[PDB]
Design a protein around this ligand. Structure first.
Ligand SMILES: [Cl-]
Length: 277
């Protein structure tokens, strides 16, 4: 409910604003939080958050608290706007292009951001978690006006109850034709589950076991298949928790603090953050 009441466009107090993409006459912005000791020639890890909202609505404000946390830990932390259905009359494949554009932009501009271009983390909640997952493992579906010599692939992912299975193949023609028109492409082309293979970037996933929007079982299957392929895919179930459980301002912030603690340790584990101390 509280995520639902967030402002668009957000204020994002303390963020620097950068336009990463111009498309359909809209400027898509990154809201960039730097650590207090940031200096130009730093080579920090970065994290880019994608808000949730069913590819229909939402706001970068959702992930403001997370950005401030990760900035305080030494990362360049940012929340990306991306086109959605209610504002821009786009479909999911467009959202995926925008997410990929954001990662590509951060990598392209890593030097001036004070960022290591091979320590860029994608993150998001629900539909934004799907987008993050697409930046790590789904091939680019389009070549927008951007630097095609720079990869769009994130180096790690941190997902908060993501959608990861968008096709029914390998689990009814009309439903896949239905999905094709909703998604703007063949459903498998924006289905992370359908692109599981060896040699993918590491990730951590936080998911409630009582999630009635994205069933936990889809995430368990994803994670099990990822481990079978030799990938580091850490799945943290939150027993009895519902969709959106991880958000700032939810359930006395307990699950908010817990997800951040475990996300932080994962980033230490993969060498993206120094140990606390
Ligand atoms: Cl739920």
């Amino acid at each position: 409910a509280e995520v639902g009441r967030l402002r668009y466009p957000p204020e994002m107090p303390g963020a620097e604003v950068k336009v990463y993409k111009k498309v359909d006459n809209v400027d898509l912005k990154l809201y960039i939080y730097k650590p207090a000791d940031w200096k130009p020639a730093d080579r920090r890890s970065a994290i880019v958050f994608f808000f949730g909202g069913g590819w229909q609505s939402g706001s970068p404000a959702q992930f403001r608290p997370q950005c401030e946390y990760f900035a305080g830990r030494g990362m360049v932390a940012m929340a990306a706007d991306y086109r959605v259905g209610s504002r821009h009359n786009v479909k999911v494949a467009d959202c995926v292009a925008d997410a990929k554009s954001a990662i590509r932009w951060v990598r392209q501009h890593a030097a001036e951001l004070g960022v290591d271009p091979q320590k860029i983390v994608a993150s998001g909640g629900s539909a934004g978690g799907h987008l993050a997952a697409c930046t790590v493992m789904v091939p680019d579906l389009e070549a927008p006006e951007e630097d095609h010599t720079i990869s769009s692939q994130a180096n790690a992912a941190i997902l908060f109850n993501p959608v990861l299975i968008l096709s029914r193949e390998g689990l009814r023609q009309d439903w896949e034709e239905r999905l094709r028109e909703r998604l703007g492409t063949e459903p498998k082309a924006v289905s992370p589950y359908h692109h599981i293979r060896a040699g993918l970037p590491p990730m951590i996933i936080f998911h409630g076991t009582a999630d009635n929007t994205v069933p936990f079982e889809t995430i368990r299957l994803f994670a099990e298949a990822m481990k079978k392929a030799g990938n580091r895919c850490e799945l943290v179930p939150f027993e009895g928790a519902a969709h959106g459980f991880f958000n700032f301002g939810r359930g006395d912030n307990l699950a908010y603090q817990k997800t951040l603690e475990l996300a932080d340790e994962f980033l230490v584990e993969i060498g993206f953050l120094a140990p606390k101390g």
